[PDB]
Amino acid sequence: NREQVFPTRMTLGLMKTKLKGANQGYSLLKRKSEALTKRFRDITKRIDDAKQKMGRVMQTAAFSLAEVSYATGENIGYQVQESVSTARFKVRARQENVSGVYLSQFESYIDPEINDFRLTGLGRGGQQVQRAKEIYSRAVETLVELASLQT
Amino acid sequence: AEKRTLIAVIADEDTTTGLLLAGIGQITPETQEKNFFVYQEGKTTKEEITDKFNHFTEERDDIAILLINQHIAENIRARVDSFTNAFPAILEIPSKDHPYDPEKDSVLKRV
Amino acid sequence: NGIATLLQAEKEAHEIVSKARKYRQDKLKQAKTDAAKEIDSYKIQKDKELKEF
Amino acid sequence: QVNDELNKMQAFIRKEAEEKAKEIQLKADQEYEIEKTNIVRNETNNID
Amino acid sequence: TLPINNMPVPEYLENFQWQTRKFKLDKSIKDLITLISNESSQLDADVRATYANYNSAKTNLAAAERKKTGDLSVRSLHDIVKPEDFVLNSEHLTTVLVAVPKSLKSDFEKSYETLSKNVVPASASVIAEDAEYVLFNVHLFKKNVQEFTTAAREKKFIPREFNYSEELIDQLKKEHDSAASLEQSLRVQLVRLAKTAYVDVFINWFHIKALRVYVESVLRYGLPPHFNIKIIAVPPKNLSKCKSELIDAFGFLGYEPFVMYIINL
């Protein structure tokens, strides 16, 4: 309940200054928690909105991919797996300073060395496969944004 | 980290194919493995899915965001809840005939 | 049915396996004690030399 | 017979655990030789 | 959500005053057309995705209802496989709990008692006996459980994760409740999206119709158009007569030479 500090006038002054510092730190950290919890509520609202957006985008992208597969006459899964030598979509971490914390937020990046697509050599539904690739690129961008939000 | 620039998907076959067409991951020349670890929910095994998820979320993996379909992540929900680390992030992508449910979101459950 | 007999034989043999490991582990503990007894003789011999000094 | 097949499975299950019983005893037997030098040598150093 | 009967779409048709949100006033005609088409197409795609998600949620709810209906092929695994017949508390033993119709269930039981290693056919016992719910329980080896399940699947039998005195029933009830809640939420989201879309897509469609009318007018009568763009709401019983009268009146401008459009919405 009490420290073992030897009672002296200097010790009393030091401990009174420590009490003042602790009270100031308590007020400061309470206000920081209030600001960060307001930001936390905002982030939760954006998480819910982005979850609804992801629910829509996955459905529409899957519909586009299914239409492309139907047009091509076969699933493009084998071609996509064969074309997995290099990565065309990458996420670069950015330590964006939000409030008083260095929260890490992802930023999507792309490279031209992996521009090959599964539509190469398919022989049918090239436009549909390209449209599905673009739709899933937009979907991956949305998921990178949501992943930054979630981190 | 700098090496974190990679996206991992453990979703169903259709979702894995779509994300591979998007170009999420690459096959490691040295490890002879790719981030597009396609695995059907009905095929393989729950233990295999858990092992793949552990490998992707640990062992100094380069994956920045782990993509797991809600259907497949439901079977490994214990491991998903255990993965309380800030990174890599995990998402519950909807699957065909398997829409994403807010109750099944492990990360959103922390609210 | 016959499933109980199949499980009982495995369970009975498993209990013997633990007993065999425990007995062997106990013998390992006894072996260390016996080895320390030989080392104690060297300490006893050293103590006699110290007494002689 | 069904009972005969179950009895045969009982012997195989018991035999499988019997093999582990020998392995457990053999592995601990090797540790006994290791323990004959480990700790005892340290005890002599403490005695020294 | 505002009811469809109270939707002001005809009231907007009575005015058709273009807004700034649907298209910028200073934007180019081609640019405005592109923007409006893109926005309306995105709205339509979102509505279609919401409808698909609602359909998937309804399918999941129907599957949960079928599982709760008591059909052993989808019912609780506790009653599907007898606890005594199913192998439990044994590290080297496991159960199959295959569910199949009478002939298929008999074939699966025979395969489990024959093909599976350490089958122990004396432990085989059927806990259900309906025509399509004649599921039986067996106690095979722990390592042979996968082989027995594969054989049952080849024998048109669906295994189940049977467990004696476990929380399987509570887990199934919780899963059904969660599926119902998710289906209700998805239905609410789809209803709200459709209610907003029936107005937004309609407004975008009317903007496209107005832009096309202006383009046709400037193409026909030259620049400036100076055309008396008017909207006529003929009664349903005299639509053909009104169209004939309009065609007759449009002959002075010499499809009819005058810009004419037919809308049934």
**Cβ of E182 and B97 within 8 Å?**
no
A101-102 vs A97-98, strand pairing mode: antiparallel
What is the spatial distance between Cα A34 and Cα A31, in angstroms, rounded to a whole number? 5
Residues E84 and E109 in one domain: yes
Q: What residues in chain C have their Cβ under 8 A from chain D's Cβ atoms?
A: 1-3, 5-10, 12-14, 16-18, 20-21, 23-25, 27-29, 31-32, 34-36, 38-40, 42-43, 46
Contact status of E72 with chain D (Cβ, < 8 Å): no
Contact status of C10 with chain E (Cβ, < 8 Å): yes
CB contacts of D29 in chain C (<8 Å) are: 24, 27-28
Instruction: Enter the tokens of residue A56.
Output: 């829509």
What is the full DSSP assignment across A8-76?
A: -HHHHHHHHHHHHHHHHHHHHHHHHHHHHHHHHHHHHHHHHHHHHHHHHHHHHHHHHHHHHHHHHTS-S
Spatial neighbors of A4 by CB under 8 A, at least 6 apart, are none
Q: What is the 3-state secondary structure (H, E, C) of A95-149?
A: CCEECCEECCEEEEEECHHHCCCCCCCCCCCHHHHHHHHHHHHHHHHHHHHHHHH
Count helices and strands (H / E) in chain E. Answer: 7, 4
Which of E38, E47, E48 best probes binding to A when mutated, by most A CB atoms within 10 angstroms? E48
CB contacts of C12 in chain E (<8 Å) are: none
Residues E208 and E33 sit within 8 Å (Cβ to Cβ): yes
Q: Go through E228-237 and write b for each residue having 16 or more CB atoms within 10 A of its CB, e for each that does not.
A: eeeeeeeeee
**Cβ of A60 and E45 within 8 Å?**
yes
Angle at C23 between CA C19 and CA C26, to 5 degrees: 140
What is the spatial distance between Cα C19 and Cα E18, in angstroms, rounded to a whole number? 90
What is the spatial distance between Cα E26 and Cα B40, in angstroms, rounded to a whole number? 52
Residues B51 and B33 sit within 8 Å (Cβ to Cβ): no
- Closest approach of chain C CAs to the CA of D42, in angstroms? 10
Contact status of B45 with chain A (Cβ, < 8 Å): no
Spatial neighbors of E184 by CB under 8 A, at least 6 apart, are none
- Long-range residue pairs from B1-4, CB within 8 A, at least 24 positions apart, any chain: B1/A93, B3/B62, B4/A91, B4/A93, B4/B62, B4/B63, B4/B64, B4/B87, B4/B88
Contact status of E265 with chain D (Cβ, < 8 Å): no
**Cβ of D5 and E141 within 8 Å?**
no
Residues E44 and E173 in one domain: yes
User: Chains touching chain D at 3 or more Cβ pairs under 8 angstroms?
Assistant: C, E
| Residue A62 amino acid letter | A
Range(s) of the domain holding residue E179: 1-73+162-224
E205: left (phi over 0), alpha (psi -120 to 50) or beta: alpha
If you measure CA to CA, which chain C residue comes closest to D13?
C10
Nearest to E135 by CA among E84, E94, E87, E77: E77
Residues E122 and E168 in one domain: no
Backbone angles phi, psi at E227, to 5 degrees: -90, 140
Place of tokens 């067996």: E138
Nearest to E159 by CA among E244, E83, E228, E74: E74
Nearest to A61 by CA among A118, A122, A133: A133
Domain boundaries, chain B: 1-111
CA C33 to chain centre: 9
CB contacts of A104 in chain B (<8 Å) are: 86-87
Identify the experimental approach: cryo-EM
What is the spatial distance between Cα A104 and Cα A98, in angstroms, rounded to a whole number? 9
Considering CB atoms only, which of E57, E178, E181 is closest to B99? E57
Residues E36 and E206 sit within 8 Å (Cβ to Cβ): no
What is the spatial distance between Cα E224 and Cα E24, in angstroms, rounded to a whole number? 20
Residues E50 and E193 sit within 8 Å (Cβ to Cβ): yes
The answer to whether the Cα torsion of A75, A81, A83, A86 is positive or negative is positive
**Cβ of C6 and E118 within 8 Å?**
yes
What is the spatial distance between Cα E120 and Cα E103, in angstroms, rounded to a whole number? 21
- Determine the CATH number of domain A9-151: 1.10.287.3240
Considering CB atoms only, which of C5, C18, C24 is closest to D29? C24
Residues E87 and E51 in one domain: no
Considering CB atoms only, which of A59, A75, A91 is closest to B65? A91
Q: What is the resolution of this structure in A?
A: 3.5
Q: Go through C7-18 and write b for each residue having 16 or more CB atoms within 10 A of its CB, e for each that does not.
A: bebbbebbeebe
Q: Give the single-character DSSP code of E238.
A: G
**Cβ of E49 and A52 within 8 Å?**
no
What is the spatial distance between Cα E34 and Cα E213, in angstroms, rounded to a whole number? 16
Instruction: Enter the tokens of residue C23.
Output: 């007995």
Residues E17 and E144 in one domain: no
What is the full DSSP assignment across D3-45?
A: HHHHHHHHHHHHHHHHHHHHHHHHHHHHHHHHHHHTTHHHHHH
CB contacts of B78 in chain E (<8 Å) are: none
Other Cβ atoms closer than 10 A to B81: 12
Radius of gyration of chain E (CA): 33
